[PDB]
Amino acid sequence: KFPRVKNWELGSITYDTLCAQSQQDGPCTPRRCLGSLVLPRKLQTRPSPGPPPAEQLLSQARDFINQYYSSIKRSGSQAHEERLQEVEAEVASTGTYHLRESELVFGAKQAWRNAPRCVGRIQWGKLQVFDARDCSSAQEMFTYICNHIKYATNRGNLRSAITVFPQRAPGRGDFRIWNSQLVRYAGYRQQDGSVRGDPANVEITELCIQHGWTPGNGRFDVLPLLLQAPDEAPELFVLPPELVLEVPLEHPTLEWFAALGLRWYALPAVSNMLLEIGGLEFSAAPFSGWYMSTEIGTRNLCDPHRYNILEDVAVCMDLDTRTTSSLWKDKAAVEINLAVLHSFQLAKVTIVDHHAATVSFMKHLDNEQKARGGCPADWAWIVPPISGSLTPVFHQEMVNYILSPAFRYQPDPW
Amino acid sequence: GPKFPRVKNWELGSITYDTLCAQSQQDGPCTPRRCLGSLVLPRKLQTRPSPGPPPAEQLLSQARDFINQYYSSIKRSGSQAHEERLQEVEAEVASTGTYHLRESELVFGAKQAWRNAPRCVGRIQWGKLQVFDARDCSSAQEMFTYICNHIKYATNRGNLRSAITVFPQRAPGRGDFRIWNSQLVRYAGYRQQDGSVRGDPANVEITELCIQHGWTPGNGRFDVLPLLLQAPDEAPELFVLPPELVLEVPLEHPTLEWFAALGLRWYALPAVSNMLLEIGGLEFSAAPFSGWYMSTEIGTRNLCDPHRYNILEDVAVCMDLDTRTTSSLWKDKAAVEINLAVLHSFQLAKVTIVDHHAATVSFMKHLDNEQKARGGCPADWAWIVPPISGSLTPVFHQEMVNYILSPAFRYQPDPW
Ligand code: HEM
Ligand code: HEM
Ligand SMILES: N=C(NO)NCCC[C@H](N)C(=O)O
Ligand SMILES: N=C(NO)NCCC[C@H](N)C(=O)O
Ligand SMILES: [Zn+2]
């Protein structure tokens, strides 16, 4: 049952004993493997048609409480048993319970640490947790969000942070940030079916306009936020421009690159994922750290279904776009990623290239093998979108599983 | 909706369901609990040398299934010819404990095995395979002749043609026909006194085996190894391939004139020879196959892997890049030029080769063909997506379902 994991570059071997702590199932079965699939239906965090079985919740709760007390080394102590009784007393009476701030802080860090698709987990211990559970309106959500952005951005010296809004309650709507990220560019479906801006945001762009936003017409227009308090229609809030740090893209040696007018925001703040700690679900808990250059240079700017600039750059580079064998695509992509690194560095905005990132992830895997006996990792997401085998992670076998606390996907609120 | 895996292509937004996996009678490494999909060698298809034949009944169910697949392919499922072959196979297994395939069944199964190979990106060519029947081979000496004939036909002076040579299957109470080498053409890996390796580090063990068996080793970086061929119940015999049969390509760069001075080269024919071909329960322990290279196999993995030739730093230094910092993307720049050199050199030498863009585009077409034909296609994402420029190819944005279908190409223990 315990997987023999091998590193093909070093020839070393380790055994993942941590996967035995996985209580939640993945999409894979012995008959077939579905690991390369992005979204699920089995792993998806379904709404509250009523309260989930007190036994199920009490079981996830006690385990989390056990995890917390081990973390502070006060396991078995009086404080530990009294807390377990508190949780049980609360679930038995109300069908749910609440976390203390220190437990929420520990839970958020473990969720990040347990994230299989995150290559920046060496930073898991350093996380600023903003308790926003004292929130009752969309307007209050906006203030907490603005403060998250101000803190996280820090004039370019990015700091990892997460803001946790009120947990889900049975028989009541969720607190939700409709946007997939706190900062995203609009995608305007221009008549011909084409798109001006980010194609990945066409839907959220349409909703913002549908809710009163007067749209622009640029390729890089920062979107307003649609914040939703329980059982209320989402409200529109335009983020203050001084809060949104952006980096104009230019190349270190190619003068004309800047002419392309490309740019990207500094803060990657995913805001559509659910944070589950001890059975409790936080439907609104935006998190952020800092970008790895390939996210912008390769995926956001070069994906065919995104900005898709590979050809424009190749033409400017005077490459042979007539045939695939000239590797015009590979060359253009390398310069674009280089332009991203040069630009962010020039602007004094935190960023990490894929080589540095994967090297530190390998160190993280080692730290974790000693600390927990394994590390859940999704190979397809950990290995960068360009130069895969040129990085150490490509040659490392990985085991993917779900541990809790965890960040999970959830249905779109509309 | 449907009761089958939902597969999405994120670039196009399209959806398909894999119904083919429902016919997968063999389990893989994964379980609901955890995914072991990134592991290269998961003890699943692994065929640890079974002392005696498969249980007459287990071999029978496998045999009946293959015969059923065969008749379905020729559209005579349920016919008299179909029912008679099933009886003949049972009678044969009943009196001898095993059975034999007709020529057309072997050709069908060999093609199916390739079609079923999850880690092969060149499967759009699956229907075009020359199957050399070598089931009459009785000696290592004859294995060599067949192998040389395979290399001559497959190489075809640069205009490569896919082929496979099938030697006698595993027999009850008789040793196996085995080719000790991982490939028909492989470069030697010499273990230096200072711990380093001259040549290909991947081949250190087979190189040392060739020496233990009488081979007089050279001392270059690109020395073609001799073959260690083994016939039933006999020690392996050493055979040197005639240099004129082994086509090689000297590597040069289209614009960087100094690249040629590096003295780098690669052989034209990728012929895996250590894999087991399983058809209807019958095991063909010696059945080398070959097609043509996809450029990244050479330019990225073989030449740039840290545990292979590891030439990244050397080429980067020649390009005058900053190898002291990761942010210069020196590894990326060098890798691109090395792959470009491989493509340019092969095209210059009139030798078949397919770049990673062309290969993945063609595999996307293959997936579409197979969706309509069988309702799915077993694919190992980690192996299908190229080692460089991954998301720049269409397959990166295509989810895939991986499972084991038979006939199949499986891994087998080293004969030593
Ligand atoms: C410290 C800097 C960080 C870096 C360099 C980093 C980098 C990455 C990268 C490259 C991905 C894949 C993104 C994609 O392909 O869309 C990712 C995913 C993820 N990261 Fe990190 N990360 C960092 C911080 C954080 C923090 C602070 C958290 C949580 C508290 C976090 C949670 C996750 C999660 C849950 C995912 C999965 C996203 C998804 O499923 O779409 N990351 N990270
Ligand atoms: C016609 C051109 C072909 C191309 C371009 C092609 C390309 C490839 C590539 C890129 C791989 C991955 C190799 C690696 O990462 O080590 C591969 C694997 C494979 N191919 Fe193909 N292939 C072709 C023909 C064939 C043929 C003719 C057969 C068999 C009859 C075949 C059977 C396989 C198998 C079983 C693997 C698995 C290798 C392993 O597990 O180590 N391929 N092929
Ligand atoms: N680096 C982070 N979080 O720290 N990335 C989160 C996903 C961001 C997404 N890949 C983007 O390009 O916008
Ligand atoms: N293209 C093929 N077969 O047609 N490849 C088989 C594996 C070859 C291996 N990747 C090599 O570089 O030698
Ligand atoms: Zn799996």
DSSP A366-380: HHHHHHTS--B--HH
Three-state DSSP class for residue B54: coil
DSSP state of A399: B
Angle at B410 between CA B156 and CA B288, to 5 degrees: 20
Instruction: Judge if B166 and B39 occupy the same domain.
Output: yes
Measure A354 CA to ligand 1 centroid, in angstroms.
Answer: 13
Distance CA B294, CA B387 (A): 11
Q: Which two tokens stand for residue B386?
A: 């190229």
Asked whether the beta carbons of B225 and B210 are under 8 A apart, the reply is: yes
Distance CA B272, CA B120 (A): 12
Q: A31–B391: do the CB atoms touch at under 8 Å?
A: no
Asked whether the beta carbons of A294 and B389 are under 8 A apart, the reply is: no
Measure B401 CA to ligand 5 centroid, in angstroms.
Answer: 9
CA-nearest residue of chain B to A359?
A: B326
Long-range contacts of A242-249 (CB under 8 A, 24+ apart): A243/A146, A243/A149, A243/A150, A243/A153, A244/A149, A244/A183, A245/A153, A245/A155, A245/A156, A245/A349, A246/A220, A247/A343, A247/A344, A247/A347, A247/A349, A248/A343, A248/A347, A249/A339, A249/A340, A249/A343
To the nearest whole angstrom, how far is the Cα of B27 from the nearest Cα of chain A?
A: 5
Atom of ligand 2 nearest to the CA of B301: 15
Neighbours of A61 (CB within 10 A): 23
Distance CA A362, CA A3 (A): 18
Asked whether the beta carbons of B183 and B272 are under 8 A apart, the reply is: yes
Atom of ligand 4 nearest to the CA of B302: 12
To the nearest whole angstrom, how far is the Cα of B25 from the nearest Cα of chain A?
A: 8
Distance CA B339, CA B345 (A): 10
Q: Look at residue A4 and tell me if it is in a domain.
A: no
Instruction: Judge if A179 and A311 occupy the same domain.
Output: no
To the nearest whole angstrom, how far is the Cα of A89 from the nearest Cα of chain B?
A: 31
Neighbours of B74 (CB within 10 A): 13
Beta bridge partners of A263: A248
Atom of ligand 2 nearest to the CA of B292: 2
Closest Cα to atom 8, ligand 4: which residue?
A: B270
Closest Cα to atom 37, ligand 1: which residue?
A: A117
Prior bond to B394 cis, omega within 30?
A: no
Strands B6-8 and B15-17 turn out to be antiparallel
Q: B30–A25: do the CB atoms touch at under 8 Å?
A: no
Beta bridge partners of A222: A185
CB of B291 closer than 6 angstroms to any ligand 4 atom? yes
Instruction: Judge if A295 and A282 occupy the same domain.
Output: no
Count of alpha carbons within 13 angstroms of residue B172, beta-carbon side: 13
Q: Which two tokens stand for residue B223?
A: 């020395």
Among residues A19, A112, A113, A121, the one annotated as catalytic is A121
Instruction: Judge if B111 and B222 occupy the same domain.
Output: no
B292 belongs to the catalytic site: yes
Q: A390–B388: do the CB atoms touch at under 8 Å?
A: yes
Among residues B115, B123, B170, B186, the one annotated as catalytic is B123
Prior bond to A405 cis, omega within 30?
A: yes
Torsion angles phi and psi, residue A246, rounded to 5 = -125, 150
Instruction: Judge if B115 and B185 occupy the same domain.
Output: no
Q: What is the CATH number of the domain that holds A35?
A: 3.90.340.10
Q: Look at residue B10 and tell me if it is in a domain.
A: no
Three-state DSSP class for residue A267: coil
CA-nearest residue of chain B to A294?
A: B391
Strands A406-408 and A246-248 turn out to be unpaired
Neighbours of A116 (CB within 10 A): 24
> What is the identity of the amino acid at B289?
F
Instruction: Judge if B209 and B235 occupy the same domain.
Output: yes
CA-nearest residue of chain B to A23?
A: B33
Neighbours of A64 (CB within 10 A): 23
Q: A31–B28: do the CB atoms touch at under 8 Å?
A: yes
Count of alpha carbons within 13 angstroms of residue A224, beta-carbon side: 18
Three-state DSSP class for residue A16: coil
Angle at B230 between CA B224 and CA B231, to 5 degrees: 145
Strands B163-166 and B178-179 turn out to be unpaired
HEC assignment per residue over A295-328: HHHHHHHHCCCCCCCHHHHHHHCCCCCCCHHHCH
Q: A3–B36: do the CB atoms touch at under 8 Å?
A: yes
Indicate the helix (H) or strand (E) that contains B114: helix B103-116
Q: B191-230 in b/e burial notation, b at 16+ Cβ within 10 A?
A: eeeeeebebbbbbeebbbbbeeeebeeeeebbbbbbbbbb
Binding residue per annotation — A300? yes
Torsion of CA B393, B396, B400, B404, to 10 degrees: 70
Indicate the helix (H) or strand (E) that contains A204: helix A202-210
In B305-334, the residues whose Cβ lies within 8 Å of chain A are 305-307, 312, 326-329, 331-333
Neighbours of A213 (CB within 10 A): 17
Measure B291 CA to ligand 2 centroid, in angstroms.
Answer: 7
Asked whether the beta carbons of A148 and A182 are under 8 A apart, the reply is: yes
Q: What is the CATH number of the domain that holds A138?
A: 3.90.440.10
Angle at A34 between CA A29 and CA A40, to 5 degrees: 100
Measure B271 CA to ligand 4 centroid, in angstroms.
Answer: 7
Distances (CA, A) of A256 to A251, A338, B127: 8, 14, 48
DSSP state of A32: B
Three-state DSSP class for residue B408: strand
Sheet bearing A225-228, strands edge to edge = A176-177, A225-228, A235-237
Distances (CA, A) of A121 to A116, A282, A289: 9, 21, 10
Asked whether the beta carbons of B405 and A316 are under 8 A apart, the reply is: no
Instruction: Judge if A165 and A183 occupy the same domain.
Output: no
Mutate to test the pocket of ligand 2, among B39, B41, B119 (most ligand atoms within 8 A of CB): B119
DSSP state of A20: G
Q: 């999850």: which residue's tokens?
A: B118
Torsion angles phi and psi, residue A262, rounded to 5 = -75, 155
Binding residue per annotation — B35? yes
Measure A269 CA to ligand 3 centroid, in angstroms.
Answer: 7
Torsion of CA A262, A265, A268, A273, to 10 degrees: -90
Binding residue per annotation — A295? yes
Asked whether the beta carbons of A113 and A123 are under 8 A apart, the reply is: no
Q: 């082929």: which residue's tokens?
A: B163
Distance CA A381, CA A390 (A): 15
Q: Which two tokens stand for residue B303?
A: 């030449």
CB of B53 closer than 6 angstroms to any ligand 4 atom? no
Distance CA B16, CA B372 (A): 10
Q: Look at residue A92 and tell me if it is in a domain.
A: yes
Distance CA B88, CA B67 (A): 11
Instruction: Judge if B188 and B97 occupy the same domain.
Output: no
**What are the residues whose beta carbons fall under 8 Å from the beta carbon of A267, sequence distance 6 or more?**
A149, A152, A153, A158, A182, A183, A244, A245, A288, A290
Long-range contacts of B101-105 (CB under 8 A, 24+ apart): B101/B279, B101/B280, B101/B282, B103/B133, B104/B70, B105/B66, B105/B67, B105/B70, B105/B279, B105/B280
Q: Which two tokens stand for residue B365?
A: 């077409």
Indicate the helix (H) or strand (E) that contains B60: helix B56-73
A397 belongs to the catalytic site: no
At how many degrees (to 10) do helices A328-346 and B330-348 cross?
170
Distance CA A54, CA A142 (A): 33
Q: Look at residue A115 and tell me if it is in a domain.
A: yes
Q: Which two tokens stand for residue A213?
A: 């936003």
Three-state DSSP class for residue B349: coil
* Torsion sign across C-alpha atoms A369, A371, A374, A378: negative
Residue contacts between A and B (CB atoms, under 8 Å): 210
**What are the residues whose beta carbons fall under 8 Å from the beta carbon of A79, sequence distance 6 or more?**
A69
Q: Which of A195, A76, A382, A116 is nearest to B34 (CA)?
A: A116
Q: Which of B75, B396, B326, B275 is nearest to A352 (CA)?
A: B326
Measure B121 CA to ligand 2 centroid, in angstroms.
Answer: 7
Instruction: Judge if A118 and A181 occupy the same domain.
Output: no
Asked whether the beta carbons of B315 and B334 are under 8 A apart, the reply is: yes
CA-nearest residue of chain A to B376?
A: A32
Torsion of CA A308, A310, A313, A319, to 10 degrees: -150
Domain tally, chain A: 3
Residues of B in contact with A389 (CB under 8 A): 300-301, 304-305, 387-388
Q: B355–A327: do the CB atoms touch at under 8 Å?
A: yes
Binding residue per annotation — B239? no
Asked whether the beta carbons of A87 and A65 are under 8 A apart, the reply is: yes
Instruction: Judge if A211 and A261 occupy the same domain.
Output: no
Distance CA B297, CA B303 (A): 9
Q: Which two tokens stand for residue A200?
A: 């990945």
Q: Which two tokens stand for residue B385?
A: 């997506």
**What are the residues whose beta carbons fall under 8 Å from the beta carbon of A87, sequence distance 6 or more?**
A58, A61, A62, A65, A97
Indicate the helix (H) or strand (E) that contains B189: strand B189-191
Asked whether the beta carbons of A224 and A186 are under 8 A apart, the reply is: no
**What are the residues whose beta carbons fall under 8 Å from the beta carbon of A26, sequence distance 6 or more?**
A34, A35, A42, A43, A400, A401, A402, B30, B32, B33, B34, B35
Asked whether the beta carbons of A114 and A378 are under 8 A apart, the reply is: no
At how many degrees (to 10) do helices B103-116 and B56-73 cross?
90
Owning domain of residue A88: 16-133+160-170+274-288+358-382
Residues of A in contact with B38 (CB under 8 A): 35, 379, 397-400
Distance CA B155, CA B387 (A): 26
Strands A400-401 and B34-35 turn out to be antiparallel
Distance CA B281, CA B58 (A): 8
Three-state DSSP class for residue B273: coil
Residues of B in contact with A9 (CB under 8 A): 305-307
Distances (CA, A) of B125 to B273, B291, B295, B359: 19, 9, 17, 11
Three-state DSSP class for residue B291: coil
Instruction: Judge if B189 and B156 occupy the same domain.
Output: yes
Indicate the helix (H) or strand (E) that contains B198: strand B197-199
Furthest-apart CA atoms within chain B: distance in Å: 72
Q: Look at residue B314 and tell me if it is in a domain.
A: yes
Distances (CA, A) of B46 to A28, A156, B277, B328, B367: 20, 53, 12, 43, 26
Q: A397–B40: do the CB atoms touch at under 8 Å?
A: yes
Count of alpha carbons within 13 angstroms of residue B99, beta-carbon side: 29
Asked whether the beta carbons of A236 and A225 are under 8 A apart, the reply is: yes
Distance CA A266, CA A130 (A): 20
End-to-end CA distance of chain A: 42
Indicate the helix (H) or strand (E) that contains A163: strand A161-164
Distance CA B315, CA B253 (A): 11
Measure B220 CA to ligand 4 centroid, in angstroms.
Answer: 22
Asked whether the beta carbons of B226 and B240 are under 8 A apart, the reply is: yes
Q: 């762009």: which residue's tokens?
A: A205
Distance CA B79, CA A187 (A): 59
DSSP state of A275: E
Distances (CA, A) of A101 to A403, B340, B383: 21, 56, 45
Instruction: Judge if A86 and A196 occupy the same domain.
Output: no
Mutate to test the pocket of ligand 4, among B297, B339, B352, B363 (most ligand atoms within 8 A of CB): B297
Q: Look at residue A112 and tell me if it is in a domain.
A: yes
Binding residue per annotation — A36? yes
Chain B contact for A94 (CB, 8 A cutoff):
no
Task: Report DSSP letters for A68-130, one per residue.
Answer: HHHHTT-TTSHHHHHHHHHHHHHHHHHS-----HHHHHHHHHHHHHH-TT-TTGGGTT--EEE
Q: How far is CA B3 from the centre of its chain?
A: 33
End-to-end CA distance of chain B: 51
Torsion of CA B32, B35, B36, B38, to 10 degrees: 150
Among residues A19, A118, A208, A375, the one annotated as catalytic is A118
**What are the residues whose beta carbons fall under 8 Å from the beta carbon of A113, sequence distance 6 or more?**
A121, A124
**Chain A interface mutation, best of B7, B38, B315, B324, highest count of A Cβ atoms under 10 Å:** B38
At how many degrees (to 10) do helices A54-71 and A101-114 cross?
90
**What are the residues whose beta carbons fall under 8 Å from the beta carbon of A76, sequence distance 6 or more?**
A69
